[PDB]
Amino acid sequence: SLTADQMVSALLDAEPPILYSEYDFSEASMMGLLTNLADRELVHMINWAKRVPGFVDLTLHDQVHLLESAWLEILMIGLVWRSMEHPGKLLFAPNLLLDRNQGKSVEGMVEIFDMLLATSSRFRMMNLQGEEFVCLKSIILLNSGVYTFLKSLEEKDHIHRVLDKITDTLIHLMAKAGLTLQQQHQRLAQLLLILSHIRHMSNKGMEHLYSMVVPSYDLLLEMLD
Amino acid sequence: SLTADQMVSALLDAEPPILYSEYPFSEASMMGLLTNLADRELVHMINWAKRVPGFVDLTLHDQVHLLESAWLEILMIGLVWRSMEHPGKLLFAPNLLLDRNQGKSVEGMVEIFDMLLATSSRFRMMNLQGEEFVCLKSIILLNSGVYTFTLKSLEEKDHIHRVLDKITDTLIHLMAKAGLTLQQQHQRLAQLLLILSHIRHMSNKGMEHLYSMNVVPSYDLLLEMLDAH
Numbered sequence: 001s002l003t004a005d006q007m008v009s010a011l012l013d014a015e016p017p018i019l020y021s022e023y024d025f026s027e028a029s030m031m032g033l034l035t036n037l038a039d040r041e042l043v044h045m046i047n048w049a050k051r052v053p054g055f056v057d058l059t060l061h062d063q064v065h066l067l068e069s070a071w072l073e074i075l076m077i078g079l080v081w082r083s084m085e086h087p088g089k090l091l092f093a094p095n096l097l098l099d100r101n102q103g104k105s106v107e108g109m110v111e112i113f114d115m116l117l118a119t120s121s122r123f124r125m126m127n128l129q130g131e132e133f134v135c136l137k138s139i140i141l142l143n144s145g146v147y148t149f150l151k152s153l154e155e156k157d158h159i160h161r162v163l164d165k166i167t168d169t170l171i172h173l174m175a176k177a178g179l180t181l182q183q184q185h186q187r188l189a190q191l192l193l194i195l196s197h198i199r200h201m202s203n204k205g206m207e208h209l210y211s212m213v214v215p216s217y218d219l220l221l222e223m224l225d
Numbered sequence: 226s227l228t229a230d231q232m233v234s235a236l237l238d239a240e241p242p243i244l245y246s247e248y249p250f251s252e253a254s255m256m257g258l259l260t261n262l263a264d265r266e267l268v269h270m271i272n273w274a275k276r277v278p279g280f281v282d283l284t285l286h287d288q289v290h291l292l293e294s295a296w297l298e299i300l301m302i303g304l305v306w307r308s309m310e311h312p313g314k315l316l317f318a319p320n321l322l323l324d325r326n327q328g329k330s331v332e333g334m335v336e337i338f339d340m341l342l343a344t345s346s347r348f349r350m351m352n353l354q355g356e357e358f359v360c361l362k363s364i365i366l367l368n369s370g371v372y373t374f375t376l377k378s379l380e381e382k383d384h385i386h387r388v389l390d391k392i393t394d395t396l397i398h399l400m401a402k403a404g405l406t407l408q409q410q411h412q413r414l415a416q417l418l419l420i421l422s423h424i425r426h427m428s429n430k431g432m433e434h435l436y437s438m439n440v441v442p443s444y445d446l447l448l449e450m451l452d453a454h
């Protein structure tokens with residue numbers, strides 16, 4: 001029943017914190033820091049998801065499936081967002097800013113590195129707004145697992161109703177921002193097509209990680225508390 | 226410079242034909258049949274792509290890269306469209322209609338089989354229209370490789386995004402013309418484009434499956450087909 005304005009406010013307040021790498025330097029250390037960072041972010045992801053309107057109306061089983069499907073995409077879009085104002089680099093954490101030459105030493109890394117950089121550049125060129133980003137991240141959560149699940153059918157119906165609410169919210173944001181109706185449709189489409197690239201990166205990133213992985217159902221369930 | 230009407234018309238006109246498998250059936254021959262089908266389908270795909278407005282304005286190198294990135298997605302969405310009206314089955318060809326249990330025979334097949342059936346069900350639930358379908362397939366062609374490509378390349382990406390914007394305009398027009406409200410127009414546009422994420426997912430899993438068993442068309446192969454005299 002939330003208005004578009006209340007949807008934005010709820011998503012903005014739900015934003016997780018920016019974490020730091022374990023601090024105080026080689027390729028082995030680099031991979032360890034990155035894995036440790038992702039593991040710590042995942043906990044905060046779970047708390048964020050529970051505050052996306054409509055998420056906790058789903059069964060716990062379905063909440064876990066959605067997180068299983070979406071967690072890597074969400075880590076990636078968060079990385080891409082905070083790397084926007086840092087051309088040519090990925091800001092994994094405020095104390096872990098890396099460029100593509102630090103990715104070359106690991107096989108398969110630089111390919112995913114450059115895809116992430118290109119997404120951040122696309123974000124930059126589109127002047128992605130924070131209100132838009134949190135809508136996009138919520139769409140990934142709800143959309144990524146919806147096609148791979150009677151009760152499931154209500155659950156899927158519910159997920160699609162929430163997704164429609166986030167679409168309404170994105171259009172509302174673009175309207176307040178002064179875009180014409182044409183520019184609203186075009187920008188909406190542009191933002192959602194980037195999500196297919198984020199899915200691709202998550203698939204390639206998963207392949208890369210299984211070449212050197214996934215949070216278990218039980219772990220995700222436990223974090224959901 | 227096309228209108229939405231001209232865009233729809235050109236896309237419908239460009240549609241490839243529905244091809245057949247060879248004329249009892251055996252699971253042992255299945256992958257040979259499907260590989261040959263896809264091979265013959267790829268030829269028509271090349272000539273389809275050349276007729277998608279704005280595609281041949283790109284360099285041959287970029288045309289190849291787009292097709293390299295999108296060919297399996299395009300085969301899959303064609304499959305899903307052909308199967309839409311056959312619940313529980315995948316209509317690879319009119320004479321090659323398979324169900325889930327026939328996918329069991331090969332390792333890792335049924336997982337992808339089920340994802341394709343779920344996409345078919347989603348198409349069916351949305352009552353996807355043929356005019357919407359051809360727009361979606363053209364978006365796949367132009368979008369899937371554009372983030373993995375220099376002044377020429379900047380010019381190419383701007384062109385690709387302008388053509389994608391035109392297709393977006395065309396999708397909205399179709400929905401407006403069919404009487405949907407603006408709220409319903411935006412909502413359906415989003416619903417359609419989010420399916421493309423699942424199609425990308427399916428393509429990556431299928432690409433893994435194909436390597437698990439000459440797996441992709443090569444650059445030079447795609448370029449020979451694309452680079453006509």
Ligand SMILES: CCCCCN1CC[C@H](COc2ccc([C@@H]3c4ccc(O)cc4CC4(CC4)N3C(=O)c3ccccc3)cc2)C1
Pocket residue numbers: 034035037038039041072075076078079092103108109110111112113116205208209213214215216219
């Ligand atoms: C112990 C119980 C369950 C254990 C599960 N975890 C234990 C292994 C499981 C690690 O998955 C991970 C491991 C590492 C990354 C980093 C990471 C970290 C933070 C970020 O915000 C974003 C990213 C982005 C990225 C792409 C994905 N990544 C990389 O390095 C990278 C970047 C560029 C090019 C190639 C690679 C993410 C996910 C999760």
Ligand SMILES: CCCCCN1CC[C@H](COc2ccc([C@@H]3c4ccc(O)cc4CC4(CC4)N3C(=O)c3ccccc3)cc2)C1
Pocket residue numbers: 259260262263264266267300301303304317328333334335337338341431434435439440441442443446
């Ligand atoms: C000389 C270099 C070779 C260049 C051409 N290659 C020739 C071998 C290289 C084979 O790719 C192929 C081979 C086979 C398929 C079928 C096929 C055929 C037609 C269709 O419309 C759609 C599909 C869909 C699907 C998923 C992909 N497929 C499968 O079986 C399948 C279906 C369900 C679950 C698991 C698997 C497509 C593509 C491509």
